[PDB]
From Swiss-Prot:
This is FACT complex subunit SPT16. The keyword Phosphoprotein applies. Belongs to the peptidase M24 family. SPT16 subfamily. Present with 18500 molecules/cell in log phase SD medium. The chain holds residues 1 to 447 of 1035 of the full protein. Component of the FACT complex, a general chromatin factor that acts to reorganize nucleosomes. The FACT complex is involved in multiple processes that require DNA as a template such as mRNA elongation, DNA replication and DNA repair. During transcription elongation the FACT complex acts as a histone chaperone that both destabilizes and restores nucleosomal structure. Forms a stable heterodimer with POB3. The SPT16-POB3 dimer weakly associates with multiple molecules of NHP6 (NHP6A or NHP6B) to form the FACT (yFACT or SNP) complex. The FACT complex interacts with the CK2 (casein kinase II) complex subunits CKA1, CKA2, CKB1 and CKB2 and the components of the transcription machinery CHD1, CTR9, PAF1 and CDC73. The FACT complex interacts with the PAF1 complex. Interacts with POL1. Interacts with SAS3. Interacts with YTA7. Keywords: Activator, Chromosome, Coiled coil, DNA damage, DNA repair, DNA replication, Nucleus, Phosphoprotein, Repressor, Transcription, Transcription regulation. It comes from Saccharomyces cerevisiae (strain ATCC 204508 / S288c). One of its GO terms (biological process) is DNA-templated DNA replication.
Amino acid sequence: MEELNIDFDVFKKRIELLYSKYNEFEGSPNSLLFVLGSSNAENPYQKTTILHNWLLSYEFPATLIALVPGKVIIITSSAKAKHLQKAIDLFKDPESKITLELWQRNNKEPELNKKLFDDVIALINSAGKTVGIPEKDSYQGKFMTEWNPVWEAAVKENEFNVIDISLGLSKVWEVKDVNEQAFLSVSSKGSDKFMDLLSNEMVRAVDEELKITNAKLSDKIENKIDDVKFLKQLSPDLSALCPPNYKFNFDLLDWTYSPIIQSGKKFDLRVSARSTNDQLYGNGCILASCGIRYNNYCSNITRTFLIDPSEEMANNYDFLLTLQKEIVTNILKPGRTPKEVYESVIEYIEKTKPELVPNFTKNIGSLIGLEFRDSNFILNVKNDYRKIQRGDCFNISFGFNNLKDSQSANNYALQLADTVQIPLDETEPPRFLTNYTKAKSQISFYF
Ligand SMILES: [Cl-]
Ligand SMILES: [Cl-]
C-alpha cells in the first residue's frame, strides 16, 4: 500500500523559512499555533488550510501544528502520522536547529486527546506568553469541540498574549519559488482550456437559441472537470508545464471557484459575482470568468465576448486592452505599493478617457497563489503597507460597469482578467500565464 505523496525536502525548507521569519512578525510571537478541524470544500482558503497546502501540499483535517523554539509539534491521527513519519529523520541532521515530533491522537479517545492538548500548551507557555494564530480561521467538528475549551482555559490561566499572524503568513509565502511558478502556469493553462470550451459552448447556445440560464451554462463548464475525455484532451498542454520531478496528476486539478457567466443589461465586476438563473442573453456584452486550481495553486481568467457590439462597446473594449498592456508593461513594478499602482492606473485613465473613471472597478485585482484572493494584498488605494516583489504572481482583473450605449440607451459592462507572473529575474518582463485570446476580432461574434 503506497503512502501519500509528500515532498519532505520542500516541507523542511518551508518550515525553516517560517521559523527564520516568525519572530519578526508584528508583535513578535514566541510560538505559532495552527488548529484545523473538518475540511470544507466551500471555504478552502483559510490561513491554516493554506499553511497545510504550503508545507505538505495536502490539507490534514483534525490536526494541530505548533512551532516553538527548537521544535515543531504535530498532533494528528495514527494514519496521518504515517504520512509524515519519514520527515522526522530529515530534521536530525547537524544543520537544523529544529526537531519534528508527531503525537498520535485518536477520534475515539477524548482523554488521550485532552492530554496531548495539555502537553502542547505547556510547551507553548515555556516558549513565552505571545502566541501567534490566524485569528480569522473558523473550523467545525469533534476535534474543535475538544480543543476550544482547553485552549480558552489556557489563554486565561497562562495569561497568553494571543495575536493575529495573518499578515506575517501572507508575507512568508508571498514570493513564488520556481516550482510554485510552474504550478501556477499549469493552473492558468487549465483556465485557458476551460475558457476555450466556455466560448465554444456560449456561441453554440446563442446560435441555436437554447433555453438555458447563465448558471446552467457555467455549470456545464464546471462539470467538465469530471469528464476524463475532456481531461485527456488538455493533459499534454498541462503536463508540459509541470516542473521536472513533479509529474502531472489529474487528481490535483480542481476549481478555484465556480465559473461565472454574465449576460443581459446588469453586471457585477466584483468577486461577489455569481452566474444568475436568467436566460442567457445572446446580444451585447457577455462576461465569463474561469479559474482552475492545480496542486492548490489558483489562477483566474476573465474575458468579454461581444455579440453584435455597438461601436462604443467595441471602442471601449479596445481601450480595455490598451489599459491592460499599460498596467502590465509600465505600472505593475517591484517596489511599488498597491496604492501607488492603483493611483497610477487612475492617472492614466484620467489622461486618456477621463469620462470612464467613475465606471472603473475599485481595484485591479490582487496577489494570487495558494489563496485565490489575499485580502492583505488587494490592488487598491487602501493598501499602502505591501511592496510588490519579484516572484509575485497576480490576478490582474478590472473593468468598467454601468456604461450606457448612446444609440440604444442599453446598459453594458466590460471586464478583463489574466494571471500574471513577475519573474524572480529583474531583466524579465511580467509573463502572462493565461494566454487565451483577448483580441477583439476573436472575441466578437455576429448572429
Ligand atoms: Cl472585487
Ligand atoms: Cl476594492
